[PDB]
Ligand code: HEM
Ligand code: HEM
Ligand SMILES: C[C@]12CC[C@H]3[C@@H](CCC4=CC(=O)CC[C@@]43C)[C@@H]1CC[C@@H]2C(=O)CO
């Protein structure tokens with residue numbers, strides 16, 4: 001009664017034809033649209049002619065729920081070779097994202113309490129909030145210098161500097177001075193290295209190393225250089241804290257990586273490695289969903305008014321105890337789910353499943369690469385009535401919200417990312433109206449992360465006309 | 471009783487690794503060895519994965535005999551895309567090698583009588599004989615100036631110029647003056663261009679234009695430039711003969727191309743296209759086996775004597791009538807067959823078959839590309855006892871298919887054999903040929919199969 005694997009419809013692509021297109025185009029910007037169309041054509045599940053091993057593409061919660069059941073003690077993902085290649089080339093340990101098996105669980109169990117748990121959030125949220133305030137304040141100052149009490153900009157650079165600053169405070173306990181000031185040359189280089197790293201990832205990611213070694217030798221060279229610059233940026237941060245904590249163990253909280261070095265449950269190389277993942281990880285992944293949310297508010301001003309109404313009503317509580325924003329801004333929290341439904345930074349969830357199972361009435365063998373395309377998932381009209389509509393209310397009225405993945409491998413940085421996102425939006429909403437003429441869809445572009453190919457011109461208009469009061 | 475097509479064993483590799491390998495290596499020099507060890511391993515027949523299109527590889531006479539029986543009235547080979555693309559880019563017509571169908575046959579039928587018929591041969595062979603006599607006489611003059619009455623050299627340059635000179639006289643009635651003299655800048659440019667054309671052909675024939683068009687745009691530019699140089703050489707030859715004939719029609723034989731022009735059974739554009747195939751196709755194809763024959767004679771001094779004695783015996787009659795060379799040197803003719811068994815200039819015959827057939831008890835559907843690999847065919851120790859032995863005698867008695875078969879068999883075969891034969895004849899009469907370099911020469915595939923090195927040969931005057 002259950003259909004066999006080969007009964008499953010097939011993506012009509014040769015791994016080779018896409019291999020060669022990636023070599024030619026130096027990327028794969030339209031992946032999300034290719035998969036989306038393929039589900040449009042073949043229905044909610046299909047397989048892909050991969051270089052041997054089975055691979056299946058799904059888009060329904062049902063399938064995620066099932067997929068979580070099959071998570072062993074050690075859930076597993078496809079090795080990301082270019083990234084792992086770098087660590088081995090320079091002698092570095094791999095952090096959680098690149099670890100599988102017991103080394104992974106061991107790390108993860110020693111990182112959850114200080115990065116993801118609610119006790120941790122209670123401690124870093126006020127640090128984030130200070131940065132969120134300083135962003136708004138800086139922007140309001142520029143706004144009130146203008147005769148019309150507004151500023152019209154590409155907000156992207158300043159949002160990226162916001163996430164570098166908020167993350168570095170939460171992770172290392174240091175203010176970099178990047179909010180309300182110009183980018184440092186270190187921050188610009190870091191941003192560029194991340195972008196080159198991500199792009200070159202897409203180029204090396206869809207072929208085996210044996211082939212790419214001689215087909216794309218200078219893409220490897222590019223990718224390692226990018227990593228080298230990312231690693232220098234992170235090692236600078238680690239050296240400063242490590243020397244500081246060698247001489248004085250503070251009595252109070254000074255961030256997430258301090259908790260890890262004080263406890264010293266993980267080894268130094270293991271802390272270094274996980275700290276690089278948190279530093280590299282905390283910039284683009286949070287920045288683009290913020291930009292997208294600003295964009296959707298800008299062109300859904302009625303939804304914007306509702307969210308402001310809420311944020312104005314909680315201003316007093318959140319001024320007094322910043323932690324209360326997590327519970328007192330449910331509609332804004334819901335807006336974020338809405339942004340990640342439409343614009344999922346992580347395009348697909350992925351497991352190399354360790355046991356036979358059944359998705360969609362098809363038999364899925366042990367060792368099958370299963371991928372969950374969140375882009376299509378979020379646009380299923382039967383589960384998301386009017387999926388084109390940006391409607392945060394839809395979450396107030398289970399496995400529908402899974403942009404951070406699921407289970408024990410669920411995003412380690414979820415609560416930091418949410419904190420950063422929510423608090424910046426909260427303070428912006430209290431002080432500014434946000435507007436655009438660009439009322440039409442921003443094309444998303446896939447380059448390991450899913451990101452806008454365009455930044456809209458947004459206008460921030462002071463409601464009040466006072467630098468502090470909202 | 472008939473195994474269906476997919477029963478048949480399968481080459482391990484895939485066409486994408488292949489083309490990437492070629493993009494990286496800038497060639498495919500081992501194609502012969504690879505296919506050979508594939509035959510050992512998988513048997514006397516296998517299919518290659520073209521991902522839909524059907525391709526079979528074979529190595530047995532048995533299989534060639536039935537490949538011919540399924541020759542139509544219009545036997546088809548695969549579109550050699552790089553070569554046809556040059557013709558299109560410059561506005562030229564295709565000659566017989568690149569034609570299929572009724573147009574192929576219309577050209578071919580008007581080409582055989584003057585290019586390949588025994589009557590054609592008797593007219594051009596004495597010309598070829600004059601050039602081959604100049605070769606040995608030039609060499610004898612140099613050889614005798616040395617105190618040990620011998621010259622040791624790499625002969626490849628001079629032999630290539632011989633074939634240029636011999637083909638040109640036979641084809642156009644012109645002596646270029648390249649035998650017993652220096653290469654000219656035209657001849658060296660010609661040889662260089664031919665070498666780049668062949669190399670670049672290998673770089674393009676193994677992928678669709680739609681991939682090579684951006685995988686290898688520089689290789690396309692290289693290819694067409696080589697062709698330009700080749701067409702310029704050939705066009706100079708054509709413009710000359712064309713002008714001479716417009717002013718005076720000979721009453722005597724002045725070569726192959728003249729007969730085509732005088733008869734005007736084919737169009738001007740058609741004569742030109744075929745004249746370029748002949749001109750471009752009569753240098754490297756003939757020169758390499760000639761070298762390999764020189765080399766194998768040097769290795770096997772016992773077989774060289776037998777051939778010498780034959781040529782000394784027939785010298786007088788051949789000087790009287792050079793046309794008797796065909797009939798009076800049966801051992802030297804056999805020699806050539808033996809050179810071509812071991813060192814086939816063209817590595818595979820090819821037919822895109824037009825009816826269904828069966829080979830090795832497999833069903834082979836219409837539209838399949840059947841390739842016969844002559845390098846392996848010739849080394850079947852089961853069919854040529856002591857396969858590495860250079861033995862002309864085994865040909866005195868469908869094993870001899872290095873010029874292919876059917877209506878499509880090599881159009882230049884008699885001109886090629888005549889050039890090879892006469893040169894060896896005049897050399898054997900006057901010199902012993904020797905080397906210390908006894909080891910097998912590695913062959914290399916760049917569209918023509920050819921020696922990768924050139925052994926140093928000593929010519930000692932008798
Ligand atoms: C909105 C922003 C973010 C999104 C949408 C996101 C999404 C994801 C997703 C889908 C996964 C895979 C989960 C799974 O396989 O179940 C993941 C893993 C991970 N994320 Fe995030 N993430 C974000 C922000 C961050 C930040 C800021 C950090 C660093 C502080 C971070 C660190 C990580 C790490 C270390 C993992 C690996 C988890 C493991 O293997 O144990 N993420 N994230
Ligand atoms: C010993 C030297 C040569 C060898 C081994 C050789 C071999 C071949 C082979 C194997 C073919 C394919 C035949 C088939 O598919 O049945 C061929 C075709 C052809 N050869 Fe040669 N060839 C040689 C010399 C020449 C020369 C000197 C010329 C021109 C002067 C020439 C002109 C051609 C032409 C025009 C074709 C195409 C015939 C057609 O498709 O109708 N060949 N040759
Ligand atoms: C989100 C993501 C997994 C988590 C990473 C993120 C890119 C930034 C990043 C860098 C790290 O060193 C740690 C993991 C991480 C935060 C990836 C981009 C796409 C990928 C996925 O979507 C897998 O589901």
Ligand SMILES: C[C@]12CC[C@H]3[C@@H](CCC4=CC(=O)CC[C@@]43C)[C@@H]1CC[C@@H]2C(=O)CO
Pocket residue numbers: 567746747748750751752755815816817818819820917918
């Ligand atoms: C011999 C050959 C077919 C005939 C051509 C030859 C290469 C040189 C050449 C150029 C021409 O303009 C006419 C045909 C020809 C003489 C080819 C090299 C390999 C190929 C084959 O192996 C046929 O199967």
